[PDB]
Amino acid sequence: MTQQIGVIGLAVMGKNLAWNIESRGYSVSVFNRSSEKTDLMVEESKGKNIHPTYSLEEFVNSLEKPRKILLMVQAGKATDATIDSLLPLLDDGDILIDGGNTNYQDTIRRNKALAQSAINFIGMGVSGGEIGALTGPSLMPGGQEEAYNKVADILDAIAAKAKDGASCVTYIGPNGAGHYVKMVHNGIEYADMQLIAESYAMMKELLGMSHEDIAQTFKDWNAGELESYLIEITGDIFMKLDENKEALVEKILDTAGQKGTGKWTSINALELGIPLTIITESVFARFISSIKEERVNASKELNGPKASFDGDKKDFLEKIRKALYMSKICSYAQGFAQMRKASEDNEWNLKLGDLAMIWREGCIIRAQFLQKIKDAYDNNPGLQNLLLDPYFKNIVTEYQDALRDVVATGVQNGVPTPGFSSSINYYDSYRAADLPANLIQAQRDYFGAHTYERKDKEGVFHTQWI
């Protein structure tokens, strides 16, 4: 009278995972604090091996040992409440797996505390949404390596299967390493969406393209280097019409939301001293678009240039394509530099070549762009920046002319390009052998006596500038 794994939190995500685990031949117990949601699942699981429970004691006593408990409750304090109530009921060696979109610092705090009580805590990032959770998500579990191996086969059976037959799951590293990589991957998707949005803004407000030509443009781009799940979905979106045979994408209110992570990865980059300019401008861009009523009033008070393009539009369309691909490359270069620094500071010993399976960028499809990131770090693990990898190096040095043109016309025509500008600014700052920071060092030496180093002489110096 025992089950092999239990799930707590029977919302859409937790219910779908329990069904996924069940469909592989595993006996699953379930529990929900409010009882109406757990017996609801019972009526939907008439043929499935799902054993409902209605108390925390019954749920824990229903699982074989070492117990494997998958936590799919609300992020934040509800998760801490579930762990705090489970802890006195658990036994030494049990495994708690938090599959929610947790801040990695909370995963580190819980994994450290429960380890003192001989309880394993695996923070697992889950990608795929409700659809993927049912059929096969991609998982980023982090925590005790021995606890992962005890549950590796369950995670392997329920995870997505790539083209190579490989499971979309691997051990990221200790404690909060899994939730961290999940956060950084989502932050990289933040940048890609903002760069695709900027590409659509120029195709619409500058080239005056229809929603038919816009959709066909992205589908063309998805066939080449820009092949990604986001580009493919973007093309289909511009083809879904509404009541009056109009593009529904244009009637959607332009206020972008975010459930954290975007804030989290930019805050982390600032803490690590990593320049995550493109992902941070993307998070800021979502902030600005939420002040919609404030923006509409500002539009009536702040004038700007009228967008005009008299030249060859289809060659400018290709320049936008090169600008999008290069800015995406700088996006990853910043994001993977962030991951390298984070593994150093957290002593995670991460393998960046193994952390290139981003979901929205073509995960199961084995997108060529992802394998190029993996191979770059695989061939040179000590690689300091993806911009210096021979492949990406060759592209950004040839595509920079297109990005500079696209940024220039965008600014001169009043169409904001926070992500495009960040990329060409990053490439120009990163490649600059000399920066005007020497002037900043001089000001800092005067105002706060912070001293300075020199380019010709060794040592540190202070100067009476006045």
Restricting to residues 151-180, name those near its own copies by CB under 8 A. Answer: none
101 is an annotated ligand-binding site residue: yes
d(CA 439, CA 33): 60
380 binds its own copies (CB under 8 A): no
End-to-end CA distance of the chain: 84
357 contact choice in its own copies, Ag ion, none (CB below 5 to 8 Å, kind-dependent): Ag ion
270 binds its own copies (CB under 8 A): yes
Restricting to residues 344-363, name those near its own copies by CB under 8 A. Answer: 360
129 is an annotated ligand-binding site residue: yes
What are phi and psi for residue 363, nearest 5 degrees? -75, -65
74 is an annotated ligand-binding site residue: yes
427 binds its own copies (CB under 8 A): yes
Restricting to residues 226-265, name those near its own copies by CB under 8 A. Answer: 230, 233-234, 236-237, 240, 248-257, 259, 263
355 contact choice in its own copies, Ag ion, none (CB below 5 to 8 Å, kind-dependent): none
Say which of 22, 68, 189, 204 is annotated catalytic: 189
| Residue in 107, 135, 110 with CA at minimum distance from that of residue 123 | 107
Let me know if 189 is a catalytic residue: yes
149 contact choice in Ag ion, its own copies, none (CB below 5 to 8 Å, kind-dependent): none
| Residue in 384, 376, 369, 195 with CA at minimum distance from that of residue 278 | 195
93 binds its own copies (CB under 8 A): no
Of the listed pieces 30-38, 67-75, 175-183, 418-426, which binds its own copies according to CB under 8 A?
Answer: 418-426
State the nearest-atom distance from the C-beta of 137 to its own copies, in Å. 12
352 is an annotated ligand-binding site residue: no
Report the SS3 class of residue 366: coil
Is the Cβ of residue 263 or residue 351 nearer to its own copies in the bound state? 263
Is the Cβ of residue 88 or residue 414 nearer to its own copies in the bound state? 414
- What is the radius of gyration, based on Cα positions, of the chain? 25
368 binds its own copies (CB under 8 A): no
438 binds its own copies (CB under 8 A): yes
Number of other CB atoms surrounding residue 2 within 10 Å: 12
Task: Evaluate whether 20 touches 30 at the Cβ level (below 8 Å).
Answer: no
What residue ranges bind Ag ion (CB under 5 A)?
127, 138, 140, 162, 168, 185, 211-212, 215, 238-239, 357, 359, 363-364
- Concatenating the DSSP letter of every residue in 320-335 gives HHHHHHHHHHHHHHHH
Helix 177-205, helix 418-430: angle, nearest 10: 120
Residue whose entry in the numeric block shows the structure tokens 């799940």:
229
Which residue of 196, 329, 356, 364 would you call a contact of its own copies, by CB under 8 A?
A: 196
Say which of 68, 182, 319, 328 is annotated catalytic: 182
Is the Cβ of residue 354 or residue 405 nearer to its own copies in the bound state? 405
- Concatenating the DSSP letter of every residue in 56-84 gives HHHHHHTB-SS-EEEE-S-TTHHHHHHHH
Distance of CA 241 to the CA centre of its chain: 29
Residue 108 burial (10 A CB sphere; 0-12, 13-18, 19+): buried
State the nearest-atom distance from the C-beta of 25 to its own copies, in Å. 28
414 binds its own copies (CB under 8 A): yes
And the tokens for 423? 């990329």
Is the Cβ of residue 81 or residue 131 nearer to its own copies in the bound state? 131
Is the Cβ of residue 212 or residue 347 nearer to Ag ion in the bound state? 212
State the nearest-atom distance from the C-beta of 184 to its own copies, in Å. 15
310 contact choice in its own copies, Ag ion, none (CB below 5 to 8 Å, kind-dependent): none
407 binds its own copies (CB under 8 A): yes
State the nearest-atom distance from the C-beta of 261 to Ag ion, in Å. 11
State the nearest-atom distance from the C-beta of 80 to its own copies, in Å. 20
d(CA 201, CA 440): 36
Restricting to residues 382-401, name those near its own copies by CB under 8 A. Answer: 384-385, 387-388, 393, 396-397, 400
And the tokens for 164? 């190579």
What are phi and psi for residue 59, nearest 5 degrees? -65, -45
185 contact choice in Ag ion, its own copies, none (CB below 5 to 8 Å, kind-dependent): Ag ion
d(CA 161, CA 148): 19
d(CA 269, CA 2): 45
Query: What does DSSP say about strands 5-8 and 68-71: parallel, antiparallel, or unpaired?
Result: parallel
Annotated binding site for NADP(+): 10, 32-34, 37, 74, 101, 129
Catalytic residues: 182, 189
